[PDB]
């Protein structure tokens, strides 16, 4: 099983003791200090040689992975984004302005502002949206039991005291809608696949916290992809719908003892962990029914880790302190509460909540846990460093990233669905559409790119071959 997917992360940005600084200028310094331009057809907005987008969005620097086909690669190129952000801030410190810029891979300032970590999944256009909604809402209400990054403060304005599973939960207000910045919906309806809209839907998911833990990001993307396969195939016969799902999202988040019971329309009363176990059981039956034991290793691994995590959550969540963000964070928080007799209103607990997500290797608390061997990893650092500058081989990001690496000077602009060349001795720009996400791969264009010594040679060889290499 594969599925085209990508992750967009808006980073928190802080520039203390700089009265000239504003969020837009600081975000631009980050984007510009790291590094062709984006093809909208005015903010700092670049495509990287790994096929990712790095740009200023809503006064935050944002990193959007290249298109990938599986959740391990999603983790890998998303983690590369953290390294890119850290390096970009270090390079911005060398700009004439000399600002010390701090970046946070989180989702709130604990004072009423939230910013987004969006997941994108490619789906069949034919899948009816009412089934997408009714099967995903209960899954999204409950997957925070392993996806949550943890938060100190209850309520969007942070005025209630205590710890909760997720940063995003208090900001959601409706079940379905177009919004992403206010009155946020559990299911966002925007459908912009940057691909053939007769074939594909792009599902745009906005409810997840950004995760530091690679295991959490892996489960977030991998379990969702399995549930989408069941929805596409019409496999789910049960009704998982719950009463008052927005209220249930908040109540689940606000109970880190994991005992709150959802009230299902069919009469059942299940905790969030129990409802997740129902989705896991169906996913196991789905994979057995479709493939037998001919299951690909990554699908088997996602199922095994999903089940193991849910079993441990129902047994004792604190045994997952090396795997899940909210557990790792809560373990530090409770350590200080015990050592220093701190109430939940203590400012030191707020600082731990935020600094956990600092991208600096020397100062971010998640990064310190990794350095001390107190966090389980999924990928190794050498591969993360390579993914900062090399694209995935099995999507159209391959063509995009390799063109920029090899012919960057002659790339006028690029986007998810095109690369635009500026060739010497030509008054017109050459737009190469890359409309299919699973074409333009190394298997399609790698040898061609190897043997072309100039962008003029490449565009010549691609001419009239659009319906071979890219669609």
């Amino acid at each position: 099983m594969h599925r085209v997917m990508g992750i967009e992360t808006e980073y928190g940005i802080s520039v203390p003791h700089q009265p000239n600084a504003n969020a837009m200028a600081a975000s631009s310094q980050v984007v510009n200090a790291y590094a062709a331009r984006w093809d909208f057809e005015g903010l700092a907005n670049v495509i990287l040689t790994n096929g990712a987008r790095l740009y200023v969005d809503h006064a935050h620097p944002e990193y959007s992975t290249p298109e990938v086909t599986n959740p391990r690669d999603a983790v890998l190129w998303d983690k590369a984004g953290e390294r890119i952000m850290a390096e970009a801030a270090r390079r911005a410190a060398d700009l004439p302005m000399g600002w010390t810029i701090q970046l946070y891979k989180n989702n709130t300032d604990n004072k009423g502002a939230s910013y987004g970590c969006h997941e994108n999944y490619l789906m069949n256009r034919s899948t009816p949206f009412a089934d997408i909604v009714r099967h995903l809402i209960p899954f999204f209400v409950t997957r925070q039991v392993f996806c949550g990054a943890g938060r100190v403060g209850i309520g969007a304005d942070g005025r209630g005291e205590g710890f909760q599973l997720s940063q995003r939960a208090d900001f959601f207000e409706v079940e379905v809608g177009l919004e992403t910045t206010l009155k946020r919906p559990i299911i966002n309806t925007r459908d912009e696949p940057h691909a053939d809209p007769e074939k594909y839907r792009r599902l745009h998911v906005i409810i997840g916290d950004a995760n530091m833990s690679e295991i959490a990001t892996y489960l977030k993307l991998g379990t969702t992809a399995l549930v989408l396969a069941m929805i596409e195939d019409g496999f789910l016969s049960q009704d998982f719908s719950v009463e008052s799902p927005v209220g249930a999202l908040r109540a689940v988040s606000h109970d880190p003892t994991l005992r709150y019971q959802l009230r299902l329309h069919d009469g059942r009363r299940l905790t969030a962990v129990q409802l997740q176990m129902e989705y896991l059981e169906q996913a196991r039956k789905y994979v057995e029914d479709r493939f037998g034991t001919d299951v690909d290793d990554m699908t088997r691994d996602v199922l095994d880790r999903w089940e193991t995590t849910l079993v441990r959550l129902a047994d004792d969540p604190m045994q997952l302190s090396r795997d899940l963000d909210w557990v790792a964070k809560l373990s530090i928080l409770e350590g200080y509460r015990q050592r220093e007799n701190l109430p939940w209103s203590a400012h030191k607990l707020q600082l731990v909540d935020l600094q956990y997500h600092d991208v600096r290797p020397d100062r971010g608390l998640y990064n310190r846990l990794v350095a001390r061997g107190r966090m389980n990893l999924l990928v190794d650092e050498a591969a993360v460093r390579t993914a900062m500058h090399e694209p995935p081989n099995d999507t159209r990001a391959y063509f995009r990233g390799r063109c920029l690496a090899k012919f960057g000077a002659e790339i006028a602009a690029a986007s998810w669905d095109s690369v635009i060349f500026d060739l010497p001795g030509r008054d017109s720009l050459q737009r190469v559409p890359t409309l299919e996400p699973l074409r333009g791969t190394r298997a399609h264009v790698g040898d061609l790119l190897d043997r072309c010594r100039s962008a003029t040679e490449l565009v010549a060889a691609l001419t009239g071959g659009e319906n071979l290499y890219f669609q």
């Binding site: 969005d57 006064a59 502002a113 910013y115 030191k348 310190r368």
Partner: peptide, 28 residues
């Protein structure tokens, strides 16, 4: 434990001022 000492070594200075001044623009 050992890890709370490592965290204490790296926490931002002026913790109450740092938390109060962490104010972000809304995003998506």
């Amino acid at each position: 434990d050992a890890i709370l000492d490592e965290i204490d070594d790296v926490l931002e200075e002026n913790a109450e001022e740092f938390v109060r001044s962490y104010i972000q623009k809304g995003g998506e």
